[PDB]
């Protein structure tokens, strides 16, 4: 397994949690802003996901989580991380700042084998587990796991497209706050709305998902786009997809198609519920997309609104580990 | 004017604030749960809209707001409210619990002339200022001012339909919390999602707008429906309308048409902005619907997503005074 | 064990969770506002404490949780609950509405043996596990488990008093929202501040703890009082106790005394931490009181501020089960 | 007046709003992170205090607010700000990062006459209006207006000390979130509790007030200290002061003394209320400290808890204009 993590943030830390849950091996973490003793504290306590049940301590300049020793670096520059000292070969690139092939390829200076960007990439091939993993090939050295919204949207869009044909769709994500937002009104020069106080406001915003699903399901390129409203919750978001369909159908056919896929090819990626759920019901949910049967509405035989929940931190971090596992099987690693 | 208010809640008090701003005359308030000394405090201090600038005191069993004496009653059953005795003939029925014609008609027993339900009604004719006021018949004794969402959606839907034709549409409102929600998970037997802790959750809910807009614009009956997500903000909501249009157009045509209507026939009802606004920017906004030019997205020549803001408490309260003014002209009063 | 629960609210439901965790047996639940199918949903999903991991279903008009069948009643009046049909003998009185001996004794009409009020009582003897359980005697038929703040304060006050003498103290609880609070400004006639919108405000409020610790530790009667600020969090609260002490001491002596008690006589009731904890770190914490070593300040040898955390829902519900277990040992039941 | 603002943040902008209300003259603003077109948006729209009523536009490289041209600069290093060229001689240093005399003195390089740090200083003399302004020496080139908490605490502590003598006291401020807090758990290396998600948590923190009040009232040096809990509100905080008094008194004496000071020497600095107020009632409040008569508690003749509110953004911003006005009189300017 031999995973390294660059950026021990919300996703960096929860990928480490997901790796331990899945028996994957992380050997090295890099973050210039989080010293080793502070890394112990940040991994141990999580306001959203609860205290890590397990021993976490610093020992001999390494982070030790349940007996596994994780080498810690504190390099500002990715090209200076000595990944090969720790034996890290598959690097999770989770800073937010090194998303292109050019930028992510800095990790090959330290001896990394493969880099997985935990965000959309302008040029690295993008993957959503359950949707297009079979297009991965072992010569791809830098890949992307797309965004949390793309991972919720792409499963549901795949089911709708295979069964009924998406002629065109528009989506909204009602989206929890992230680390890029601000506690009170402050400077966000490249996104003025995103600078307004996160706890006070519904904030219109862009979404990664819009473009990205057109690269993940190329048949849908240019037939889907959408936007986000950031709202004052700390985690868990919901896709609200309005689609026009090519084939006439009832809402029962939509539900039966989603149910059948969640039991078979999309098992573990797409969930299905008919309960009266609210967003707190998905905190810590492992799935990429949970179809909410009761919340959706069909106006006519070809125009419908479908609602699907995702823990944007936790479900995504579990898919990073799923993607790395797939890549190492194909690579033989 | 000779307005009485039944139910001195969020809408009841802000209707009095709006009447004061618009020089309307409120002569009587009734609320069994809010004794006179408490009405002073409740009217003076408001967490969302700020302290009432001006004098509120109790004298002689009356609420005296800026010189005006308002007779206070504390009746549980509307039958027993002496409206006659205070001279209240136009009754704002803002309790939430007497919405049908037969239930609202109880105010006639104490000599009310007309009742205005401040919510959708199963059978009282619904009006939205700027959209269908000319349907108001002088012989209508119980009318409805529809919901906060219908008052936002109907202006924008009017413009789109007149210019481009709405073939079908689906709406979401991302809606602030209201008084029927719960601070922590508790019993809401008729709406199980709506009982979950309001501050913790994105909560799927129904919208009044779903029924009402096909009544207010009858040619759109059956062509439009939608749902709500309640999110943890205290006030100000946003309509997200995804429409399939009859006529090919660009997004510039949609903008130009909304700008022209806000300057002309829909002036004061529909507003227009191109600023990078967020929900807090509309707290205290007088308009029913404020079109957000920059947040909308056109996918194709006939498929588009339009975003409009509304202060669900305040814009609505001002519309209730507008409705009464219009009714009084038609009745001659 | 043979526990019945009256009021299946935040405390009613979490006492059921605590009973299952501790292997205690609940046989009957009464709530007139929550029908059986709705009880399934409310027990299964918890916005604060996460989904119940376990099977919950309605079967043959009973609630079935992990194989245990729990008879459900829906009586408005406590004297009409046929507790003996279900074999319920120890009743948790968790409505909030039947707190005196007179009111709580209604349950003896249905065949209850003992009633435990999950709130301060004006006359029923009040108990805090770890502090005064040894004053319980088997002839006491109605008892109280005091409030969540009293359960946090009393352990810490006991340690300080035994070691250093409390001459006098004043406390504040910075306290999460409860079900008595309101989503937006509405009527709370007996507590005007408590009616103001809970998510918008710091709200000064009274506390149960103030008086109650004087009944639980009678040596401290009249030497302690205090108040609450309700703040916009959904659970977890913190006591901030300013004490003048009879014996001169350093902060190290305070910490060593708290540490020694958390390892011995107060084990499981009083916790001890020296980490940089925040309130989310205590969600689901079992203890009544967790001393925060780093947050406290000693101004002089006899004047100090001590800070102690408590999950006001969860820690309290576990103490209800602890108190019932103690009572059945003393009663032989 | 000839005021320049360095750092157009929460305090920098509200200081300009306060200068406009008080007819002070701001001539220049500097912020490297906020370009002129963005300064218009940031000044016009405010989530906490509402939209600026009046004209804000950019013309010719200047910010024009109600007719006034303000020269805008975008310098990173204060040394390089041409204050001379705009005529700015009294500089509000509101960046948060140039708080020491030597760091603040950089503004003299571009011809500033005086600097006012809008935060406590390790060595610049601190002033609180109404408490120690007469200590201001004309030869003081760098002064401090202390923190929002010192400006609340010092007026109330002055009154108590003058009338009853403070023997020792311990304070807590329940403090709104600020810009140094984080929207979700993230790195705050110097304050680990302060990095945890602001909207989710009660967070123990330090207070500026702890140091500063013994400097502002030197006879209370060593007799007073305290701490903060940061809670999820956007603005408005509350001091909770527990004091041991030298002279026996009743709570009526404390009330009478606070009322007399707010009418006389501390008028406009200290306010007094007996209403059932909550934090939202003070948003936009001009005063430094508003004594809450009803929330305080006296335990004995010498031991009492006093509660005072403050709008930490707005009251403070107005005090900065007061301080500059006073300094200009003493300097003759
Ligand atoms: N938050 C979510 O729900 C979520 C989900 C999926 C994807 N993402 C994506 O993952 C990335 C990180 O997001 P996040 O939410 O974890 O943010 P975050 O701010 O919590 O984490 C970023 C981390 O990277 C560290 N860092 C910054 N510069 C570094 C550098 N030069 N070298 C190494 N480490 C550095 C920071 O200290 C921080 O700990 C982004 O691209 C984001 O869009 C976020
Ligand atoms: N809150 C909004 O944004 C909004 C906007 C538009 C319309 N409305 C509608 O207005 C109505 C009231 O809503 P609200 O937000 O003001 O709720 P609310 O709870 O604030 O007010 C309801 C008021 O009615 C009073 N009341 C209850 N029974 C009474 C009775 N028998 N007689 C007289 N008064 C009584 C209550 O004491 C309370 O003060 C609802 O139908 C709601 O759908 C609400
Ligand atoms: N919330 C906490 O942190 C906490 C902690 C300790 C103690 N308490 C106390 O426990 C009691 C309940 O508090 P809560 O937070 O669970 O409130 P809650 O509102 O969540 O629960 C009250 C429950 O009692 C039910 N009920 C009302 N009348 C009834 C009746 N006539 N018969 C039977 N059931 C009825 C309601 O439907 C509701 O489900 C109060 O006395 C409260 O002060 C609360
Ligand atoms: N927020 C409050 O309630 C409050 C009240 C009183 C005092 N203060 C103090 O005022 C100071 C600023 O606080 P704030 O709340 O306004 O924070 P903030 O983050 O809103 O504002 C800081 C501003 O300084 C700017 N800045 C950063 N570096 C700069 C530089 N090198 N030159 C010029 N400008 C630069 C930033 O762009 C930002 O706009 C702090 O010292 C704070 O403690 C805050």
Asked if residue C73 and residue C88 are part of one domain, the reply reads yes
Integer Cα distance of B120 and B170 in angstroms: 19
CB contact under 8 A, B295 and A225: no
D183 close to A181: Cβ distance less than 8 angstroms: yes
Asked if residue D220 and residue D323 are part of one domain, the reply reads no
How many angstroms separate the first and last alpha carbons of chain B? 7
Asked if residue A167 and residue A108 are part of one domain, the reply reads no
Asked if residue C307 and residue C158 are part of one domain, the reply reads yes
What are the CB-based long-range contacts (under 8 Å, 24+) for C218-225? C219/C161, C220/C157, C220/C161, C220/C166, C223/C166, C223/C167, C223/C168, C223/C169, C223/D299, C224/C153, C224/C157, C224/C166, C224/C168, C224/C169, C224/C170, C224/C171, C224/D299, C225/C170, C225/C171, C225/D297, C225/D299
Question: Which among A34, A45, A197 has CB closest to D234?
Answer: A197
Tallying the residues shown for chain C, one arrives at 333
Contacts of residue A197, Cβ cutoff 8 Å, sequence gap at least 6: A182, A183, A184, A185, B280, D47, D48, D234
Give CA angle at A179 (A174, A180), nearest 5°. 80
> Which tokens hold the place of B213?
């807009």
> Which tokens hold the place of A74?
């504190």
Give the closest residue to C178 by CA, choosing from C156, C154, C150, C203: C203
H-run or E-run covering D240: strand D237-245
CB contact under 8 A, A283 and C50: yes
> Which tokens hold the place of C52?
């119940």
Q: What is the sign of the dihedral through the CA atoms of D154, D157, D159 and D161? A: negative
Asked if residue C204 and residue C159 are part of one domain, the reply reads yes
Tell me which residue has tokens 């701001």. Answer: D26
Identify the domain containing residue D190 by its residue range: 147-312
Q: Which residue from A minimizes the CA distance to D48?
A: A200
Integer Cα distance of C323 and C22 in angstroms: 12
* Strand ranges (E), A20-130: 26-30, 56-59, 62-65, 68-73, 90-93, 114-117
D168 close to C303: Cβ distance less than 8 angstroms: yes
Q: Which residue from C minimizes the CA distance to D292?
A: C204
C11 in contact with ligand 3, CB cutoff 6 A: yes
> Which tokens hold the place of C195?
């009616």
Asked if residue A317 and residue A238 are part of one domain, the reply reads no
Q: What is the CATH number of the domain that holds B286?
A: 3.30.360.10
Give CA angle at A17 (A16, A21), nearest 5°. 115
A107 close to A30: Cβ distance less than 8 angstroms: no
- Exposure of C53 by Cβ count < 10 A (0-12 exposed, 13-18 middle, 19+ buried)? exposed
DSSP A168: E
Asked if residue C317 and residue C303 are part of one domain, the reply reads no
DSSP B125: P
Tell me which residue has tokens 């999309």. Answer: A266
Instruction: Measure CA B142 to chain center.
Output: 16
Helix and strand totals (H; E) in chain B? 8, 16
Asked if residue A281 and residue A136 are part of one domain, the reply reads no
Question: Which among D238, D297, D303 has CB closest to C202?
Answer: D238
D289 close to D316: Cβ distance less than 8 angstroms: no
Contacts of residue D54, Cβ cutoff 8 Å, sequence gap at least 6: D20, D65, D66
Q: Is C111 left (phi over 0), alpha (psi -120 to 50) or beta?
A: left
H-run or E-run covering B13: helix B10-21
H-run or E-run covering D95: none
Helix and strand totals (H; E) in chain A? 8, 16
Give the closest residue to A262 by CA, choosing from A173, A165, A156: A156
Contacts of residue A324, Cβ cutoff 8 Å, sequence gap at least 6: A1, A3, A24, A90, A92, A116
Number of domains comprising chain A: 2
C164 close to C246: Cβ distance less than 8 angstroms: yes
Integer Cα distance of D110 and B297 in angstroms: 48
Integer Cα distance of D162 and B263 in angstroms: 62
Neighbours of C34 (CB within 10 A): 25
DSSP strand pairing (C62-65 vs C56-59): antiparallel
CB contact under 8 A, D183 and A196: no
Integer Cα distance of B88 and B26 in angstroms: 8
Q: Among C72, C76, C95, which is best to mutate for testing ligand 3, by the most ligand atoms less than 8 A from CB? A: C95
Q: D152 catalytic, yes or no?
A: no
Integer Cα distance of A151 and A129 in angstroms: 8
Integer Cα distance of B283 and B274 in angstroms: 17
* Strand ranges (E), A246-296: 270-273, 289-292
Full DSSP string of C161-176: HHHH-EEEEEEEEEE-
Asked if residue A286 and residue A322 are part of one domain, the reply reads no
Give CA angle at A94 (A90, A100), nearest 5°. 85
Contacts of residue C212, Cβ cutoff 8 Å, sequence gap at least 6: C120, C126, C146, C147, C150
Asked if residue A267 and residue A227 are part of one domain, the reply reads yes
Q: Which residues of D touch A181 (CB under 8 A)?
A: 183
Report the residue of B182, B204, B230 to disrupt the A interface, i.e. the one with the largest count of A CBs within 10 Å. Answer: B204
B184 close to C10: Cβ distance less than 8 angstroms: yes
Which residues of C touch chain D, with CB atoms under 8 Å apart? Answer: 168-170, 172, 174, 192-193, 196-197, 200-204, 223-227, 229, 231-233, 236-238, 240, 242, 244, 276-280, 292, 294-295, 297, 299-300, 303-305, 307
CA torsion, ordered A177, A181, A186, A187, to nearest 10 deg: -150
- In this complex, the chains that touch B, judged by 3 or more CB pairs closer than 8 A, are A, C, D
Asked if residue D25 and residue D108 are part of one domain, the reply reads yes
Tell me which residue has tokens 């005296």. Answer: B64
Q: What is the CATH number of the domain that holds B106?
A: 3.40.50.720
Asked if residue B152 and residue B117 are part of one domain, the reply reads no
What 3-state DSSP class applies to A100? coil
């Amino acid at each position: 397994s031999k995973i390294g993590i660059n950026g021990f943030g919300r996703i960096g830390r929860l990928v480490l949690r997901a790796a331990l849950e899945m028996g994957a091996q992380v050997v090295a973490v890099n973050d210039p802003f989080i010293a080793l003793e502070y890394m112990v504290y940040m991994f141990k306590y999580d306001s959203t996901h609860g205290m890590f049940k397990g021993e976490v301590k610093a020992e001999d300049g390494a982070l030790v989580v349940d007996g596994k020793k994780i080498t810690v670096f504190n390099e500002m520059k990715p090209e200076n991380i000595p990944w090969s000292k720790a034996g890290a070969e598959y690097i999770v690139e989770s800073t937010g700042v090194f998303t292109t092939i050019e930028k992510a390829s800095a990790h090959f200076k330290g001896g990394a084998k493969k880099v997985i960007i935990s965000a959309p990439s302008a040029d690295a091939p993008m993957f959503v587990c359950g949707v297009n993993l079979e297009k991965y090939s072992k010569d791809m050295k830098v890949v992307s796991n797309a965004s949390c919204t793309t991972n919720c949207l792409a499963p549901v869009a795949k089911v709708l497209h295979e069964n009924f044909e998406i002629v065109e769709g528009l989506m909204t994500t009602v989206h929890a706050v992230t680390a890029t937002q601000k506690t009170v009104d402050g400077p966000s020069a490249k996104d003025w709305r995103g600078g307004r106080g996160a706890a006070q406001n519904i904030i219109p915003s862009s979404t990664g998902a819009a473009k990205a699903v057109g690269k993940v399901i190329p048949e849908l390129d240019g037939k889907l786009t959408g936007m986000a409203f950031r709202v004052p919750t700390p985690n868990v978001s919901v896709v609200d997809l309005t689609v026009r369909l090519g084939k006439e159908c009832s809402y029962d056919d939509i539900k039966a198609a989603m149910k059948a896929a969640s039991e078979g090819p999309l098992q573990g990626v797409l969930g299905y519920t008919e309960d009266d759920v609210v967003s707190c019901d998905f905190t810590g949910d492992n799935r990429s997309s949970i179809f909410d049967a009761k919340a959706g509405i069909q106006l006519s035989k070809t125009f419908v609104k479908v609602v699907s929940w995702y823990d944007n931190e936790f479900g995504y971090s579990q898919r990073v580990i799923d993607l790395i596992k797939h890549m190492q099987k194909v690579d033989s690693a």
